[PDB]
């Protein structure tokens, strides 16, 4: 089932006339074009039974025609009212438009209403989020590229911490992000976390210009955007020899994460995956300190479906991608998290990141 | 002269019951709070004749109260419907709300309508833009800090280029942004441009992992966000001895930019400022190659008002801030731009950036 066909089937089922898709990430997802319109107007118009139309600024039309296929492409000059050009091209009859409710601003829905009349807007985002749940081989490959960058970030981060000489959490963040920028990474997927010692137990912890603590653990949670797709991974290392207590917390988290990784395959449920890690940490005596769900979906965003959490009986299927990230967080003492995102295969799963999970001493 | 009083006067003039201001930059402009709510809900509610209310996510309430006065601050927990919490707190009755049409997504206006009924929305953004046109002394001081960072960026950028040894445009960009990050400047005001030789003549040029050319010029266009305010500046240097033709292009741009700077004072028009530089470049024989407006406004954004462009007879006033950035772009030969942003004073103007404008050889 092609994604565009699926949206047309939705329009026919809901008796909605057309889409006007505006989020650049959705446009890239559905057309392959990474179109940045800024505050100029772009929109993908899928219909119940007609050729899809892609509307762009005039200076993007040449290239859109070359880098997309199957779309009827037209543009507008800055001297024109974009909504008027849309109306002039969409000839009859429009009373309902499917839009992305959290993206489209009032100026755009009012612009559409000025040309088409009193239209009923319908939210397309639930459908798009459902479509994103199962990744194609092409998407999985793009996520592997992002995962390879994340592994390089760990290598850079560990080495930067080991140099000591007053290096701070924020120093390490800057160095990681500097090396990524040099390699053409447009942005990290989320704010890089480097947290020393007990600071890693703070759920709202953020790296600051504080020196990393000797003989304490050091948490690295990081990820990049590459080719439109995200990575997300956590490793916790030791700066000098840790004490026995912190080393055992790491061992517990490490084993819980590996047990969930060894368990994941099609047919198990999200609840069951969460429980493999949660039960192990709870048996070890630290259930009170593992205070978030085991995992979240990842794709173009760092936080999408599925939710790997108690009470979700969703059956895991091939092509799902999600995090596996148990942790133990004891305020004022120690925090450990170990995280990979993974994709589900026909008969198991594979991680997007391969950095050693063991407690390495630097 | 309070900004809030000015908005209340608008509501009374237009017979609008209250605001629901959502853009984080506007919220900072009017309250001083740098609140990034992300996908959680925040809103500033100014009324015709009652105390202003600030609605935030629960975890932002404590900081809102600590650093504001005169606002009634209340929050909502993630378990609550934010629109219900808003409705329960507003005891006056509401039929019209002033909002920012280009910011507020359909989910938020529909959330308001679900609780308040059939609301008439009125665009507040023309007023906000009018207020932002004239900067206070406090805003100019913050913009001077951002410009001072931009000057540090040039020093770093020039030095990184001088090291040669295969350094690329993207290498230099990465080093600039790395040093800004280390100084607590996590984001630039726009995508840093470093463009070598004929690549600087491309109006859509972007830095890539290509080595900088010897005996060609090198264009640096950059700026930072600091304290909520932006900077923006361009310098063009030489990598090794330039050729005479490129050096003369630089001289023409340099003289045109300085001539416009010497001309600016209250009472001149935007058209006249543009014409000072444009007439020089045209007399020199390169009018066809100066293919953009002389300047744009700057403030919290790098793209605001006034527009320094032919046909804009706007009278320049004290406190306006804008760029002065002539350029000559000869495809496949050379591109030179020299840019400062400036603030208009009682009897002239002053620049936000002070890096040498001369054609320096590195
Ligand atoms: Mn993570
Ligand atoms: Mn995660
Ligand atoms: Mn610039
Ligand atoms: Mn500029």
PDB file of C-alpha atoms in Angstrom, chain B residues 197-322:
ATOM      1  CA  UNK B 197      35.996  32.417  -4.139  1.00  0.00           C
ATOM      2  CA  UNK B 198      33.372  32.156  -6.870  1.00  0.00           C
ATOM      3  CA  UNK B 199      31.112  30.256  -4.445  1.00  0.00           C
ATOM      4  CA  UNK B 200      30.483  33.541  -2.638  1.00  0.00           C
ATOM      5  CA  UNK B 201      28.762  34.879  -5.785  1.00  0.00           C
ATOM      6  CA  UNK B 202      25.994  32.278  -5.427  1.00  0.00           C
ATOM      7  CA  UNK B 203      22.948  33.895  -3.758  1.00  0.00           C
ATOM      8  CA  UNK B 204      21.984  30.419  -2.496  1.00  0.00           C
ATOM      9  CA  UNK B 205      25.513  29.427  -1.510  1.00  0.00           C
ATOM     10  CA  UNK B 206      25.975  27.341   1.600  1.00  0.00           C
ATOM     11  CA  UNK B 207      29.211  26.183   3.257  1.00  0.00           C
ATOM     12  CA  UNK B 208      30.299  22.688   2.263  1.00  0.00           C
ATOM     13  CA  UNK B 209      33.237  20.373   2.991  1.00  0.00           C
ATOM     14  CA  UNK B 210      35.358  21.918   0.238  1.00  0.00           C
ATOM     15  CA  UNK B 211      38.811  23.413   0.739  1.00  0.00           C
ATOM     16  CA  UNK B 212      39.063  27.192   0.739  1.00  0.00           C
ATOM     17  CA  UNK B 213      40.760  28.587  -2.364  1.00  0.00           C
ATOM     18  CA  UNK B 214      44.135  30.338  -2.182  1.00  0.00           C
ATOM     19  CA  UNK B 215      44.322  33.871  -3.639  1.00  0.00           C
ATOM     20  CA  UNK B 216      40.539  34.156  -3.513  1.00  0.00           C
ATOM     21  CA  UNK B 217      38.311  36.040  -1.129  1.00  0.00           C
ATOM     22  CA  UNK B 218      36.395  34.379   1.693  1.00  0.00           C
ATOM     23  CA  UNK B 219      32.993  35.631   2.831  1.00  0.00           C
ATOM     24  CA  UNK B 220      31.865  35.272   6.479  1.00  0.00           C
ATOM     25  CA  UNK B 221      28.172  35.978   7.282  1.00  0.00           C
ATOM     26  CA  UNK B 222      27.250  35.119  10.862  1.00  0.00           C
ATOM     27  CA  UNK B 223      25.385  36.104  14.009  1.00  0.00           C
ATOM     28  CA  UNK B 224      24.277  34.819  17.388  1.00  0.00           C
ATOM     29  CA  UNK B 225      21.279  34.839  19.697  1.00  0.00           C
ATOM     30  CA  UNK B 226      22.099  36.250  23.114  1.00  0.00           C
ATOM     31  CA  UNK B 227      19.651  37.211  25.854  1.00  0.00           C
ATOM     32  CA  UNK B 228      16.776  36.920  23.377  1.00  0.00           C
ATOM     33  CA  UNK B 229      18.315  39.299  20.804  1.00  0.00           C
ATOM     34  CA  UNK B 230      20.115  38.705  17.499  1.00  0.00           C
ATOM     35  CA  UNK B 231      23.222  39.932  15.737  1.00  0.00           C
ATOM     36  CA  UNK B 232      24.095  39.722  12.041  1.00  0.00           C
ATOM     37  CA  UNK B 233      27.312  40.753  10.275  1.00  0.00           C
ATOM     38  CA  UNK B 234      29.380  40.018   7.161  1.00  0.00           C
ATOM     39  CA  UNK B 235      33.079  40.480   6.483  1.00  0.00           C
ATOM     40  CA  UNK B 236      35.023  39.403   3.387  1.00  0.00           C
ATOM     41  CA  UNK B 237      38.765  38.696   3.739  1.00  0.00           C
ATOM     42  CA  UNK B 238      41.519  37.445   1.427  1.00  0.00           C
ATOM     43  CA  UNK B 239      43.229  34.063   1.738  1.00  0.00           C
ATOM     44  CA  UNK B 240      46.711  34.937   0.508  1.00  0.00           C
ATOM     45  CA  UNK B 241      47.243  37.846  -1.867  1.00  0.00           C
ATOM     46  CA  UNK B 242      44.044  38.578  -3.816  1.00  0.00           C
ATOM     47  CA  UNK B 243      43.972  39.560  -7.448  1.00  0.00           C
ATOM     48  CA  UNK B 244      43.498  43.233  -8.342  1.00  0.00           C
ATOM     49  CA  UNK B 245      39.983  42.733  -9.729  1.00  0.00           C
ATOM     50  CA  UNK B 246      38.646  41.126  -6.562  1.00  0.00           C
ATOM     51  CA  UNK B 247      40.415  43.717  -4.388  1.00  0.00           C
ATOM     52  CA  UNK B 248      38.723  46.538  -6.306  1.00  0.00           C
ATOM     53  CA  UNK B 249      35.289  44.898  -5.931  1.00  0.00           C
ATOM     54  CA  UNK B 250      35.940  44.780  -2.181  1.00  0.00           C
ATOM     55  CA  UNK B 251      36.945  48.458  -2.135  1.00  0.00           C
ATOM     56  CA  UNK B 252      33.730  49.487  -3.912  1.00  0.00           C
ATOM     57  CA  UNK B 253      31.524  47.519  -1.500  1.00  0.00           C
ATOM     58  CA  UNK B 254      33.485  48.829   1.495  1.00  0.00           C
ATOM     59  CA  UNK B 255      33.097  52.436   0.396  1.00  0.00           C
ATOM     60  CA  UNK B 256      29.393  52.006  -0.379  1.00  0.00           C
ATOM     61  CA  UNK B 257      28.720  50.476   3.033  1.00  0.00           C
ATOM     62  CA  UNK B 258      30.626  53.230   4.845  1.00  0.00           C
ATOM     63  CA  UNK B 259      28.825  55.910   2.814  1.00  0.00           C
ATOM     64  CA  UNK B 260      25.444  54.556   3.918  1.00  0.00           C
ATOM     65  CA  UNK B 261      26.655  54.400   7.535  1.00  0.00           C
ATOM     66  CA  UNK B 262      27.766  58.050   7.358  1.00  0.00           C
ATOM     67  CA  UNK B 263      24.388  59.036   5.897  1.00  0.00           C
ATOM     68  CA  UNK B 264      22.006  57.397   8.386  1.00  0.00           C
ATOM     69  CA  UNK B 265      20.273  59.676  10.903  1.00  0.00           C
ATOM     70  CA  UNK B 266      16.662  60.361  11.927  1.00  0.00           C
ATOM     71  CA  UNK B 267      14.702  62.006   9.122  1.00  0.00           C
ATOM     72  CA  UNK B 268      16.192  60.241   6.098  1.00  0.00           C
ATOM     73  CA  UNK B 269      14.013  57.606   4.420  1.00  0.00           C
ATOM     74  CA  UNK B 270      14.615  53.902   3.944  1.00  0.00           C
ATOM     75  CA  UNK B 271      14.645  54.490   0.174  1.00  0.00           C
ATOM     76  CA  UNK B 272      17.312  57.184   0.534  1.00  0.00           C
ATOM     77  CA  UNK B 273      19.543  54.939   2.660  1.00  0.00           C
ATOM     78  CA  UNK B 274      19.316  52.144   0.092  1.00  0.00           C
ATOM     79  CA  UNK B 275      20.055  54.634  -2.707  1.00  0.00           C
ATOM     80  CA  UNK B 276      23.254  55.966  -1.082  1.00  0.00           C
ATOM     81  CA  UNK B 277      24.969  52.578  -1.388  1.00  0.00           C
ATOM     82  CA  UNK B 278      23.168  51.533  -4.575  1.00  0.00           C
ATOM     83  CA  UNK B 279      24.076  54.766  -6.418  1.00  0.00           C
ATOM     84  CA  UNK B 280      27.777  54.250  -5.576  1.00  0.00           C
ATOM     85  CA  UNK B 281      27.820  50.669  -6.777  1.00  0.00           C
ATOM     86  CA  UNK B 282      25.903  51.672  -9.903  1.00  0.00           C
ATOM     87  CA  UNK B 283      28.289  54.558 -10.711  1.00  0.00           C
ATOM     88  CA  UNK B 284      31.187  52.152 -10.292  1.00  0.00           C
ATOM     89  CA  UNK B 285      29.630  49.971 -12.993  1.00  0.00           C
ATOM     90  CA  UNK B 286      28.298  47.066 -10.918  1.00  0.00           C
ATOM     91  CA  UNK B 287      24.641  47.954 -10.355  1.00  0.00           C
ATOM     92  CA  UNK B 288      23.489  44.768 -12.104  1.00  0.00           C
ATOM     93  CA  UNK B 289      25.453  42.704  -9.561  1.00  0.00           C
ATOM     94  CA  UNK B 290      23.964  44.277  -6.394  1.00  0.00           C
ATOM     95  CA  UNK B 291      20.728  42.319  -6.542  1.00  0.00           C
ATOM     96  CA  UNK B 292      19.229  42.560  -3.042  1.00  0.00           C
ATOM     97  CA  UNK B 293      17.921  45.290  -0.770  1.00  0.00           C
ATOM     98  CA  UNK B 294      20.464  47.216   1.281  1.00  0.00           C
ATOM     99  CA  UNK B 295      19.048  46.138   4.618  1.00  0.00           C
ATOM    100  CA  UNK B 296      16.462  44.527   6.879  1.00  0.00           C
ATOM    101  CA  UNK B 297      15.384  45.164  10.452  1.00  0.00           C
ATOM    102  CA  UNK B 298      16.929  43.273  13.358  1.00  0.00           C
ATOM    103  CA  UNK B 299      15.880  42.823  16.973  1.00  0.00           C
ATOM    104  CA  UNK B 300      14.690  39.612  18.571  1.00  0.00           C
ATOM    105  CA  UNK B 301      14.807  38.194  14.999  1.00  0.00           C
ATOM    106  CA  UNK B 302      17.254  38.736  12.135  1.00  0.00           C
ATOM    107  CA  UNK B 303      14.310  39.351   9.809  1.00  0.00           C
ATOM    108  CA  UNK B 304      12.177  42.228  11.031  1.00  0.00           C
ATOM    109  CA  UNK B 305      11.598  45.901  10.223  1.00  0.00           C
ATOM    110  CA  UNK B 306      12.343  48.409   8.785  1.00  0.00           C
ATOM    111  CA  UNK B 307      12.987  47.267   5.206  1.00  0.00           C
ATOM    112  CA  UNK B 308      15.820  49.300   3.678  1.00  0.00           C
ATOM    113  CA  UNK B 309      14.720  48.969   0.057  1.00  0.00           C
ATOM    114  CA  UNK B 310      13.867  51.169  -2.896  1.00  0.00           C
ATOM    115  CA  UNK B 311      10.280  52.412  -2.800  1.00  0.00           C
ATOM    116  CA  UNK B 312       9.976  52.368   1.002  1.00  0.00           C
ATOM    117  CA  UNK B 313       9.610  56.042   1.900  1.00  0.00           C
ATOM    118  CA  UNK B 314       9.427  55.216   5.630  1.00  0.00           C
ATOM    119  CA  UNK B 315      11.079  57.960   7.685  1.00  0.00           C
ATOM    120  CA  UNK B 316      13.951  56.508   9.728  1.00  0.00           C
ATOM    121  CA  UNK B 317      13.605  57.198  13.473  1.00  0.00           C
ATOM    122  CA  UNK B 318      15.790  57.021  16.564  1.00  0.00           C
ATOM    123  CA  UNK B 319      15.780  53.517  18.009  1.00  0.00           C
ATOM    124  CA  UNK B 320      15.241  51.694  14.718  1.00  0.00           C
ATOM    125  CA  UNK B 321      17.729  48.872  14.136  1.00  0.00           C
ATOM    126  CA  UNK B 322      18.608  47.399  10.756  1.00  0.00           C
TER     127      UNK B 322
END
